[PDB]
Nucleic acid binder design. Structure first.
Lengths: 153, 177, 88
RNA sequence: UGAAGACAUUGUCAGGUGGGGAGUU
């Protein structure tokens, strides 16, 4: 019961920061969401991915780092063993994030601020965030030798 | 030749959704401002570019025989059936895949259902009756079918147990030769 | 068990409207679907039916919403076609 | 008043096709 009460307060603060879009806190919030998402109800796990997509779509409308932060979180959410075994059941498809990471590669080259900078999400370098996303897509912890060849190429 | 009505397009896509995932990619625009369309010619559905469809209108309908890739035919009772002529489309965005070994490829090409002794690679979390595309060990698509049992239930099955029902094989090309 | 299509069964007005009915044994005009927008609406329904049951409330809402936007685009496209044909 | 540009766009004849639209037996 106390765990549920703390989870209510911890997660409510996390979401209110995301809604107000505090620039110096979103990295810390996404680390918390990735850490504690497996402790909450199943139906809310799919909502977390949908909430991540809205943040990326909002930034698509600085901005490069925020979209990369969400993409790192989305893969780290699925890299958990519990979420991995519930892929089919809970309809957790990362095709949106894989495509979005693909269409952003050309723009990220021209960005000059790629180097202006134990954590898994909150990392200060956008280049580091890009490498973490690429490692997730091309070198996943699970099913490393079942990756589609077209995606690799 | 005429385009599909809204009843027929629903039937065609329902059968395609049984086998493939991203049907939006099928009809998405191309780089040069062109797109793929569906056409009906003698109760046969054809997948073809719009530019090819427009320039094929010069051919009289009694003189036209083929156009692009043929998905299948609408049966007399109003039911779309896929044909192996649609396999290159199916394999491009296949949802569930099954790989058969050398000892299973030849029986499959003769027209036999896949059994446990033929399977060399599954697709995890595949429901009981789903549409799967059949490959060999060299990732060469041989055909498609419907699965007989779930992947979890198929693992505990006997070696001489049906794991997939055949629906089309590339050996049918020898038929119309 | 026999099909209701085989039997000449009158169509009934319900919460689902009957609309304008067509006489039997006559030319029911073929309404072709060839626009990308018209195909998108049909495709969204097919994908929704195949997916079936989704446990997430938000993910269920998004699936319904993309069908709504597909319908809106199709209605907007057909409206523009009517205006162009009516004007020009 | 500025931009593009002798290319598009458009128009006229001759044709091909037309399971769609209109009319007739």
């Amino acid at each position: 019961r106390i765990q549920s009460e703390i989870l209510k307060m911890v997660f409510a603060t996390y979401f209110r920061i995301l809604k107000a879009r505090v620039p110096h806190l979103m990295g810390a919030v996404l680390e918390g969401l990735a850490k504690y998402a497996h402790l909450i109800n199943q139906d809310f796990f799919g909502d977390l991915l949908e909430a991540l997509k809205d943040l990326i779509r909002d930034t698509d409308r600085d901005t490069s780092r925020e979209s990369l932060l969400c993409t790192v979180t989305a893969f780290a959410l699925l890299e958990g063993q519990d979420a991995h075994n519930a892929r089919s059941d809970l309809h957790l498809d990362l095709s949106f994030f894989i495509t979005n990471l693909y269409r952003s590669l050309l723009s990220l080259s021209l960005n000059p601020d790629l180097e202006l900078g134990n954590n898994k999400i909150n990392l200060q370098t956008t280049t580091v965030l890009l490498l973490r996303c690429l490692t997730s897509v091309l070198l996943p912890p699970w099913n490393i030798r079942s990756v589609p060849p077209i995606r690799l190429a | 030749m005429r385009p599909l009505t809204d009843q027929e397009m629903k039937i065609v896509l329902d059968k395609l959704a049984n086998y493939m995932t991203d049907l939006k990619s099928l009809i998405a625009p191309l780089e040069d401002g062109d797109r793929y369309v569906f056409r009906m010619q003698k109760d046969r559905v054809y997948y073809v570019k719009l530019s090819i469809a427009n320039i094929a209108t010069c051919v009289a309908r009694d003189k036209l025989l083929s156009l692009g890739t043929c998905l299948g035919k609408m049966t007399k009772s109003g039911k779309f059936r896929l044909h192996i002529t649609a396999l290159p489309i199916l394999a491009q965005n296949a949802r569930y895949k099954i790989w058969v070994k050398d000892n299973g490829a030849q029986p499959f090409l003769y027209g036999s259902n896949i059994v446990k002794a033929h399977v060399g690679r599954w697709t995890e979390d595949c429901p009981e009756h789903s549409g799967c595309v059949v490959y060999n060990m060299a990732d060469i698509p041989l055909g498609f079918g419907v699965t007989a049992r779930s992947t979890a239930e198929a693992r505990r099955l006997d070696p001489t147990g049906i794991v997939c029902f055949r629906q089309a094989d590339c050996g049918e090309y020898l038929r119309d030769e | 068990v026999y099909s209701e299509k085989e039997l000449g069964i009158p169509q009934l007005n319900t919460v689902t409207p009957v609309g304008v009915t067509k006489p039997k044994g006559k030319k029911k005009g073929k309404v072709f679907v060839d626009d990308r927008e018209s195909m998108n609406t049909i495709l969204a329904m097919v994908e929704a039916e195949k997916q079936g049951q989704i446990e997430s409330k938000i993910m269920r809402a998004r699936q319904l919403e993309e069908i709504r936007e597909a319908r809106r685009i199709e209605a907007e496209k057909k409206e523009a076609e009517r205006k162009a044909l009516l004007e020009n």
